[PDB]
Design a protein around this nucleic acid. Structure first.
Ligand SMILES: [Mg+2]
Ligand SMILES: [Mg+2]
Ligand SMILES: [Mg+2]
Ligand SMILES: [Mg+2]
Ligand SMILES: [Mg+2]
Ligand SMILES: [Mg+2]
Ligand SMILES: [Mg+2]
Ligand SMILES: [Mg+2]
Ligand SMILES: [Mg+2]
Ligand SMILES: [Mg+2]
Ligand SMILES: [Mg+2]
Ligand SMILES: [Mg+2]
Ligand SMILES: [Mg+2]
Ligand SMILES: [Mg+2]
Ligand SMILES: [Mg+2]
Ligand SMILES: [Mg+2]
Ligand SMILES: [Mg+2]
Ligand SMILES: [Mg+2]
Ligand SMILES: [Mg+2]
Ligand SMILES: [Mg+2]
Ligand SMILES: [Mg+2]
Ligand SMILES: [Mg+2]
Ligand SMILES: [Mg+2]
Ligand SMILES: [Mg+2]
Ligand SMILES: [Mg+2]
Ligand SMILES: [Mg+2]
Ligand SMILES: [Mg+2]
Ligand SMILES: [Mg+2]
Ligand SMILES: [Mg+2]
Ligand SMILES: [Mg+2]
Ligand SMILES: [Mg+2]
Ligand SMILES: [Mg+2]
Ligand SMILES: [Mg+2]
Ligand SMILES: [Mg+2]
Ligand SMILES: [Mg+2]
Ligand SMILES: [Mg+2]
Ligand SMILES: [Mg+2]
Ligand SMILES: [Mg+2]
Ligand SMILES: [Mg+2]
Ligand SMILES: [Mg+2]
Ligand SMILES: [Mg+2]
Ligand SMILES: [Mg+2]
Ligand SMILES: [Mg+2]
Ligand SMILES: [Mg+2]
Ligand SMILES: [Mg+2]
Ligand SMILES: [Mg+2]
Ligand SMILES: [Mg+2]
Ligand SMILES: [Mg+2]
Ligand SMILES: [Mg+2]
Ligand SMILES: [Mg+2]
Ligand SMILES: [Mg+2]
Ligand SMILES: [Mg+2]
Ligand SMILES: [Mg+2]
Ligand SMILES: [Mg+2]
Ligand SMILES: [Mg+2]
Ligand SMILES: [Mg+2]
Ligand SMILES: [Mg+2]
Ligand SMILES: [Mg+2]
Ligand SMILES: [Mg+2]
Ligand SMILES: [Mg+2]
Ligand SMILES: [Mg+2]
Ligand SMILES: [Mg+2]
Ligand SMILES: [Mg+2]
Ligand SMILES: [Mg+2]
Ligand SMILES: [Mg+2]
Ligand SMILES: [Mg+2]
Ligand SMILES: [Mg+2]
Ligand SMILES: [Mg+2]
Ligand SMILES: [Mg+2]
Ligand SMILES: [Mg+2]
Ligand SMILES: [Mg+2]
Ligand SMILES: [Mg+2]
Ligand SMILES: [Mg+2]
Ligand SMILES: [Mg+2]
Ligand SMILES: [Mg+2]
Ligand SMILES: [Mg+2]
Ligand SMILES: [Mg+2]
Ligand SMILES: [Mg+2]
Ligand SMILES: [Mg+2]
Ligand SMILES: [Mg+2]
Ligand SMILES: [Mg+2]
Ligand SMILES: [Mg+2]
Ligand SMILES: [Mg+2]
Ligand SMILES: [Mg+2]
Ligand SMILES: [Mg+2]
Ligand SMILES: [Mg+2]
Ligand SMILES: [Mg+2]
Ligand SMILES: [Mg+2]
Ligand SMILES: [Mg+2]
Ligand SMILES: [Mg+2]
Ligand SMILES: [Mg+2]
Ligand SMILES: [Mg+2]
Ligand SMILES: [Mg+2]
Ligand SMILES: [Mg+2]
Ligand SMILES: [Mg+2]
Ligand SMILES: [Mg+2]
Ligand SMILES: [Mg+2]
Ligand SMILES: [Mg+2]
Ligand SMILES: [Mg+2]
Ligand SMILES: [Mg+2]
Ligand SMILES: [Mg+2]
Ligand SMILES: [Mg+2]
Ligand SMILES: [Mg+2]
Ligand SMILES: [Mg+2]
Ligand SMILES: [Mg+2]
Ligand SMILES: [Mg+2]
Ligand SMILES: [Mg+2]
Ligand SMILES: [Mg+2]
Ligand SMILES: [Mg+2]
Ligand SMILES: [Mg+2]
Ligand SMILES: [Mg+2]
Ligand SMILES: [Mg+2]
Ligand SMILES: [Mg+2]
Ligand SMILES: [Mg+2]
Ligand SMILES: [Mg+2]
Ligand SMILES: [Mg+2]
Ligand SMILES: [Mg+2]
Ligand SMILES: [Mg+2]
Ligand SMILES: [Mg+2]
Ligand SMILES: [Mg+2]
Ligand SMILES: [Mg+2]
Ligand SMILES: [Mg+2]
Ligand SMILES: [Mg+2]
Ligand SMILES: [Mg+2]
Ligand SMILES: [Mg+2]
Ligand SMILES: [Mg+2]
Ligand SMILES: [Mg+2]
Ligand SMILES: [Mg+2]
Ligand SMILES: [Mg+2]
Ligand SMILES: [Mg+2]
Ligand SMILES: [Mg+2]
Ligand SMILES: [Mg+2]
Ligand SMILES: [Mg+2]
Ligand SMILES: [Mg+2]
Ligand SMILES: [Mg+2]
Ligand SMILES: [Mg+2]
Ligand SMILES: [Mg+2]
Ligand SMILES: [Mg+2]
Ligand SMILES: [Mg+2]
Ligand SMILES: [Mg+2]
Ligand SMILES: [Mg+2]
Ligand SMILES: [Mg+2]
Ligand SMILES: [Mg+2]
Ligand SMILES: [Mg+2]
Ligand SMILES: [Mg+2]
Ligand SMILES: [Mg+2]
Ligand SMILES: [Mg+2]
Ligand SMILES: [Mg+2]
Ligand SMILES: [Mg+2]
Ligand SMILES: [Mg+2]
Ligand SMILES: [Mg+2]
Ligand SMILES: [Mg+2]
Ligand SMILES: [Mg+2]
Ligand SMILES: [Mg+2]
Ligand SMILES: [Mg+2]
Ligand SMILES: [Mg+2]
Ligand SMILES: [Mg+2]
Lengths: 272, 45
RNA sequence: CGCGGGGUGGAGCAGCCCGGUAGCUCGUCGGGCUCAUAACCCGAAGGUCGUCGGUUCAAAUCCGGCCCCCGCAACCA
RNA sequence: CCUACGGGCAGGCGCCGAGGGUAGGGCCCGUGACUGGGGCGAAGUCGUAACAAGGUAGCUGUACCGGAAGGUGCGGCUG
RNA sequence: CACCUCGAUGUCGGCUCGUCGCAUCCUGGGGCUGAAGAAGGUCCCAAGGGUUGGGCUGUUCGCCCAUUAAAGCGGCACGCG
RNA sequence: UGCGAAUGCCGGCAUGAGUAACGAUAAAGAGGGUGAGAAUCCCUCUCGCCGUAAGCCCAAGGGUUCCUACGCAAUGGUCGUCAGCGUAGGGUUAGGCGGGACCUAAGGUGAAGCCGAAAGGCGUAGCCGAAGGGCAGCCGGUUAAUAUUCCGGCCCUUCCCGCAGGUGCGAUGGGGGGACGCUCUAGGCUAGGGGGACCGGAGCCAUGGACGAGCCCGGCCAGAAGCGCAGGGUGGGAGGUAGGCAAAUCCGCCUCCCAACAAGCUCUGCGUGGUGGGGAAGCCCGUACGGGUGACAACCCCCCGAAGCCAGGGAGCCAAGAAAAGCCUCUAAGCACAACCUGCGGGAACCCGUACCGCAAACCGACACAGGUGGGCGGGUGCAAGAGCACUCAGGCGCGCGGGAGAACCCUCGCCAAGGAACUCUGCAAGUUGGCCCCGUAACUUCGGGAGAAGGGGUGCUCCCUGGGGUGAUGAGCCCCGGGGAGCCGCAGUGAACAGGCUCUGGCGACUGUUUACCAAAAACACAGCUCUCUGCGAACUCGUAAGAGGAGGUAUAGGGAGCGACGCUUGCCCGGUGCCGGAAGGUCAAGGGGAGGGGUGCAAGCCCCGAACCGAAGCCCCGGUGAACGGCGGCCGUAACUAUAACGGUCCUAAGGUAGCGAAAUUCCUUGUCGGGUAAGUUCCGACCUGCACGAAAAGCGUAACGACCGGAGCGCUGUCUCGGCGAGGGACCCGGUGAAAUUGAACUGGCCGUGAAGAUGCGGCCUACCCGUGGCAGGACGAAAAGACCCCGUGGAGCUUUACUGC
RNA sequence: GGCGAGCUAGCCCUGGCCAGGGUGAAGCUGGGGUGAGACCCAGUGGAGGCCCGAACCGGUGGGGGAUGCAAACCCCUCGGA
RNA sequence: CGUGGUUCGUGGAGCCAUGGGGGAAUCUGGGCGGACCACCGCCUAAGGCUAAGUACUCCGGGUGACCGAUAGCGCACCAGU
């Protein structure tokens, strides 16, 4: 549960590494169903469009299965739980009896031997995916679809969960990781349980270099700039914002709400 | 120290070459120019 | 030297703009309640308005000289 | 050099060695701009905390706050 | 004050090397003294030569330590890049 | 259409001037040859210099610079008979080496498709795209000049055809595979290297000795099958099947049965191998290079041993480590008198490159330029190791002006009596220290550190005794770690070379890191970490007119913006103003709706203009919240039984009047504040007071071990820093021969003083002084050169930057 | 309206390089310890924007150079490794 | 309603063109003569073709009170070298 280090070098002092005991006998993460060449590049055609990115360990993509209705009724055995450098979560490799293999984002407490299944049928046990509507009010769940058949998009980060607070008409009321209250169509497949590797929140990179392996380049405060290139920049020995704090592009960054108002999605939301 | 000219046969054709000049419309113009003027060489060698 | 504000009963302030009225709190004095003191209640006194002129019928008020007190400024060199 | 020489003495070298020097530690004492609380001291200032439901029962361990005594929160004791 | 210099007259102090003035800090010669002697005060003559080493500060300056016959003041583009 | 000026334009020729310089201080000397001519070209001998190179191979780039004959006008910083230069002729040989008739990567391009006023942009498949993947040649000889290319020896691949044998053959499709990190690392080998009394070899005995197990020299290279030694790879059989976008007998999954071993099968590496070939010193030849001999050369044992090979080996770890083809297997249409597989045999095997330079005189730097340039090899001895340092092999060089002289002065070095920071802005500089082994080592601390703390001792050689390991047989040898003892020598034993000065104490920043390419390396940026805020996913945000793309093939333990900056203890009060957030009411307001009413022209119908009320958004007003949002955080007067002082009070004002802590501070004006400390003496330094001109809590507050080419103070050590200089060395400076610049320049026959003058006179006045002309030196003057002053102002001149300046997008 | 990332900055794909020394984290094994533990001690092991130090990357102080060898150089010293 | 064109810069602003909205008629129908109405006249939109007179000079010729090698084209010459 998060390994510590003795201070035999500074930065090693408060540094902290993940615990890999949930990683079933695993290394080369089996080709076929993933990997897949991951085109890692920090911008688009030409220009940088997201700042302070680059470098970082080269990594094979693990093509995971984010829609499970693909295999209604066909159960599967949990073969392994392995490392995926593409998400905070860990991925379980599950063999189907169909003979087909695919990865799923590993729920918490999912043991390496369980039979798993998806469908209106499906016993309500950790690992099984079901259309929301057929899931008992109050059960936690993850990897939720937002619209039927469009693939799971909610609660996929390590530790993230989602409760089903109720039902109404064709929809069910979910409380999301954000704390938002969302009507979601009952036909949307979720999968019981909460993501997992939840100690993930408490790791401590420790050093500058560590943030770089993850491919995060240094981040420079506007403050440290000249007026040419950022709203806060210049005036001798620095100086308070001197205006309502803003992003390099001019817009205010403290409090100013940015969600588009007329979003049709609006009439299905109800919280923070 | 290290100066600005580091010759590279491939770079020079890939950049100022004839086939390169001919794609961009601005490039065709360069050629159209050097011809009008009568340049013995429309392109680096 | 520059610039701006200020000086009014014992203390701290208002009244100066917009001319003629001097006002508030505390303190002070006399009287009550108290064994007594404070608090509390009833009454009262006290200011020429920093000085010298000027304007005006009339100046704390408008004007100028000075006397003070406070603040700011003094940069390129 | 002396003999009563396969010796003695002188002399030479070496160990140890008082102490002297250089270096770094420890324990104790005295002293120091300034500084903390404490005791004592016929008639100083401020308030009223306690003793009588002390005029908000008191005390208590902890915690935050306050010119000061103290106040408040949490739990405990009844003395 | 704005006269030469803004098609450039490098701007403090230090170091080096000096040279001049005397309105003299010391030594030489004096008058007066409230000059007994010794030592001083004060003014006159005198520019020959001499006028220390340190601590503080970029400092010039100034303070201080230790001396000394004395620890002189100025000018030379606040002498001299 | 008339020139003397424009720091004018083009050109020519002067001055400085025979002046500076002739490009690393690695270094030269003589003899002989050639030639009109020789320090400079050829040869010999002697000397010196590189040797993880200044030697050798490869890739870029360069493009005749390559070899030979002839040649010296110019290029060569001198010379030139020489040359990389002029003329001419020669020279680059591949089925196996590199690249192409193979594969894919980023990226590019791009049928379909999408978007854009035109130009064009995006874009699935596909295609292009390599130092990555695939793939068959090793060694010797020969040329003046090429060679894995010619030859020689041994060996190999693909394609076509045929013969035989074998099988359902068949792919752009399916599957297996190719296939992948970092650090450490096992065994066995190889390159490589040292030794040998053994094997082979011309000769050598010098100068006192040595005819000797003497000295000197060499004792290998490539190589099929087969065989050995090491290692990698891999389960076999059967049955069920709904998955691997058709089908598979293949793969996947399930049950069962046998091996779990590498046994078997298979691949690679190493060894041995037929055969092929090389083969020193020395001496003889003649070079401008090489050649004959040595030779019928010999060709063997021992040891040290990789970072390389067996290779996909093993272990640990987190940051979790390309693709496609070749390849194998499976089947599909299709064909099965096909086709494919194995073996043999004959035939066929194309294009381009190949000279030379390649750490540099041939590449990038206008230059035969002290700079820059990727990969491999890089021997020996010694020093603890090593690619370090010294010397040296192979090889290559003395860097294309020289000769003398022995001044000042400069550069680079060496030493110095006594003193030892007195130097100075500062110990700047330089010195001291210095490797290994052992003894020993503080406060403090985050328990790791601080630590190489500090401070010490040992270090050579000779002989004797003696322990352990690797390889061998347990043995000798050889190689490696040592242990004890007695002695010898010097001023000195890491005897030369490479090799920390130390301590105390503050400031800033936690730390390693990053930065103004070329005046700033820092206390600045970044950094892990804290907080705020935005974003429910066609997310926010960014780029784009768009399509689209990044975000992300991510999903709130996630992503964007902002501030702060390890860690420790903490981060107070003010929401009045500005921002942001919430607020279905009300106030206001645009287009639009709406039309009461007015008007223009018509004989009229009508036609056509205006236009009230009223219903019409966001925004603003208004109403609340919000401080790790922009921000802010009082004044006067009095008061205690000495005095002062003020816990206490009075009053004015404010949105509220700065809490903890810190404080003459990177902040303190007054100021060298005052007191203490250090010093003989302290404007700085440390401690302290608070009178904070003008600290204060995430533009964070106060501390903090460790860390720092940061910045301040003190001491020890040691010194040419200094008192205060002296001597010495080498490279210049000087002289001689050769070559030969530059800024600058109105013209010159160019003195001092005191004056004057546009106010600082060689040039005017008066006087003074002074024969003509050079050379080595010094810098006071020519308001000396250089740059049309960067400061300052001026121009209704420019430009970057800002905002509650104006007006737009 | 065009030309430039053959210099320099960032990123992307694919290769390469970092002599030799030292310090000794986890884990492991053994011994101790307990009711079982924690934990302790050895030995082993070999972690780290760890240490010394060439290559390689740097540009700290100083001296020289200033019509330079050089339109950023040379020497000594120094940082990372 | 928003714009362009015309001398027309919102002006009394027509005419011609048209991005947006609404949206006819076919001879007694339509457009125009500078807001609008009347009167009076002019012309037949929403399809198209059409020589010549006009513009230019790479090129050829003829002329010159044009140049004469620092002129004249950048080039009198193996120069867009
Ligand atoms: Mg930052
Ligand atoms: Mg800045
Ligand atoms: Mg910019
Ligand atoms: Mg801005
Ligand atoms: Mg700002
Ligand atoms: Mg500031
Ligand atoms: Mg150039
Ligand atoms: Mg060129
Ligand atoms: Mg290339
Ligand atoms: Mg075209
Ligand atoms: Mg031609
Ligand atoms: Mg008063
Ligand atoms: Mg009263
Ligand atoms: Mg009374
Ligand atoms: Mg009066
Ligand atoms: Mg200014
Ligand atoms: Mg005391
Ligand atoms: Mg006391
Ligand atoms: Mg009480
Ligand atoms: Mg009481
Ligand atoms: Mg009580
Ligand atoms: Mg109070
Ligand atoms: Mg309590
Ligand atoms: Mg209680
Ligand atoms: Mg003037
Ligand atoms: Mg005047
Ligand atoms: Mg001049
Ligand atoms: Mg006199
Ligand atoms: Mg000083
Ligand atoms: Mg003087
Ligand atoms: Mg003056
Ligand atoms: Mg001066
Ligand atoms: Mg100077
Ligand atoms: Mg002339
Ligand atoms: Mg003239
Ligand atoms: Mg000529
Ligand atoms: Mg001269
Ligand atoms: Mg000379
Ligand atoms: Mg000379
Ligand atoms: Mg060479
Ligand atoms: Mg040639
Ligand atoms: Mg010749
Ligand atoms: Mg010649
Ligand atoms: Mg010559
Ligand atoms: Mg030359
Ligand atoms: Mg040649
Ligand atoms: Mg030639
Ligand atoms: Mg080759
Ligand atoms: Mg073909
Ligand atoms: Mg291809
Ligand atoms: Mg394109
Ligand atoms: Mg290709
Ligand atoms: Mg290849
Ligand atoms: Mg090949
Ligand atoms: Mg060969
Ligand atoms: Mg050759
Ligand atoms: Mg060998
Ligand atoms: Mg050998
Ligand atoms: Mg013989
Ligand atoms: Mg002899
Ligand atoms: Mg013999
Ligand atoms: Mg040998
Ligand atoms: Mg099996
Ligand atoms: Mg072999
Ligand atoms: Mg073999
Ligand atoms: Mg033979
Ligand atoms: Mg030779
Ligand atoms: Mg492995
Ligand atoms: Mg293909
Ligand atoms: Mg088959
Ligand atoms: Mg060749
Ligand atoms: Mg060659
Ligand atoms: Mg060469
Ligand atoms: Mg070569
Ligand atoms: Mg090289
Ligand atoms: Mg060159
Ligand atoms: Mg040369
Ligand atoms: Mg060179
Ligand atoms: Mg470089
Ligand atoms: Mg030795
Ligand atoms: Mg060594
Ligand atoms: Mg070396
Ligand atoms: Mg040598
Ligand atoms: Mg040699
Ligand atoms: Mg030379
Ligand atoms: Mg000395
Ligand atoms: Mg001495
Ligand atoms: Mg001493
Ligand atoms: Mg001093
Ligand atoms: Mg001094
Ligand atoms: Mg120094
Ligand atoms: Mg040294
Ligand atoms: Mg320390
Ligand atoms: Mg010896
Ligand atoms: Mg042995
Ligand atoms: Mg050292
Ligand atoms: Mg060091
Ligand atoms: Mg730092
Ligand atoms: Mg740099
Ligand atoms: Mg710089
Ligand atoms: Mg997207
Ligand atoms: Mg993506
Ligand atoms: Mg900061
Ligand atoms: Mg705060
Ligand atoms: Mg507020
Ligand atoms: Mg408010
Ligand atoms: Mg507000
Ligand atoms: Mg408001
Ligand atoms: Mg008393
Ligand atoms: Mg301050
Ligand atoms: Mg003292
Ligand atoms: Mg200072
Ligand atoms: Mg303050
Ligand atoms: Mg501050
Ligand atoms: Mg703040
Ligand atoms: Mg800070
Ligand atoms: Mg501090
Ligand atoms: Mg650093
Ligand atoms: Mg530093
Ligand atoms: Mg000296
Ligand atoms: Mg003369
Ligand atoms: Mg004069
Ligand atoms: Mg005259
Ligand atoms: Mg004269
Ligand atoms: Mg002279
Ligand atoms: Mg001079
Ligand atoms: Mg000179
Ligand atoms: Mg000048
Ligand atoms: Mg000017
Ligand atoms: Mg202007
Ligand atoms: Mg580049
Ligand atoms: Mg390190
Ligand atoms: Mg370090
Ligand atoms: Mg290091
Ligand atoms: Mg290397
Ligand atoms: Mg330097
Ligand atoms: Mg620098
Ligand atoms: Mg330097
Ligand atoms: Mg320098
Ligand atoms: Mg060093
Ligand atoms: Mg270094
Ligand atoms: Mg107008
Ligand atoms: Mg329309
Ligand atoms: Mg009509
Ligand atoms: Mg008309
Ligand atoms: Mg009309
Ligand atoms: Mg008409
Ligand atoms: Mg019509
Ligand atoms: Mg018509
Ligand atoms: Mg026409
Ligand atoms: Mg013509
Ligand atoms: Mg003529
Ligand atoms: Mg001519
Ligand atoms: Mg001409
Ligand atoms: Mg022409
Ligand atoms: Mg011309
Ligand atoms: Mg021509």
């Amino acid at each position: 549960a998060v390994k510590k280090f003795k201070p035999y070098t500074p930065s090693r002092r408060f540094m902290t590494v993940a615990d890999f005991s949930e990683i079933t006998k695993t290394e080369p993460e089996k080709s076929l169903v993933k990997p897949l060449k991951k085109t890692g590049g920090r911008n688009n055609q030409g220009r940088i469009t997201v700042r302070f990115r680059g470098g970082g360990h080269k990594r094979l993509y693990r093509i995971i299965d984010f829609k499970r209705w693909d295999k209604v009724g066909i159960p599967a055995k949990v073969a392994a739980i392995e490392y995926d450098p593409n998400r905070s979560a860990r991925i379980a490799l599950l063999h189907y009896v169909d003979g087909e293999k695919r990865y799923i984002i590993a729920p918490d407490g999912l043991q390496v031997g369980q039979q798993v299944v998806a469908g209106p049928d499906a016993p309500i046990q950790v690992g099984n995916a079901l259309p929301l509507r057929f899931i008992p009010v109050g059960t936690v769940v993850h990897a939720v679809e937002l619209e039927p058949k469009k693939g799971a998009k909610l609660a996929r980060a390590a530790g993230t969960s989602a409760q089903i607070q109720g039902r109404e008409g064709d929809y069910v009321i979910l409380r999301l990781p954000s704390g938002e209250l969302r009507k979601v169509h009952g036909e949307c497949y979720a999968t019981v349980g909460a993501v997992g590797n939840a100690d993930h929140k408490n790791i401590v990179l420790g050093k500058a270099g560590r943030s770089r392996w993850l491919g995060r380049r240094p981040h420079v405060r506007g403050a440290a700039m000249n007026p040419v290139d950022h709203p806060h920049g210049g005036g001798e020995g620095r100086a308070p914002r001197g205006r309502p704090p803003a992003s390099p592009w001019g817009w205010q960054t403290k409090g100013l709400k940015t969600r588009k108002r007329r979003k049709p999605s609006s009439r299905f939301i109800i919280a923070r | 120290m290290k100066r600005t000219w580091q010759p590279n046969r491939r770079k020079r054709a890939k950049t100022h070459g004839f086939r390169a000049r001919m794609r961009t419309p601005g490039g065709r113009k360069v050629l159209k120019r050097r011809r009008q003027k009568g340049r013995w060489r429309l392109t680096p060698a």
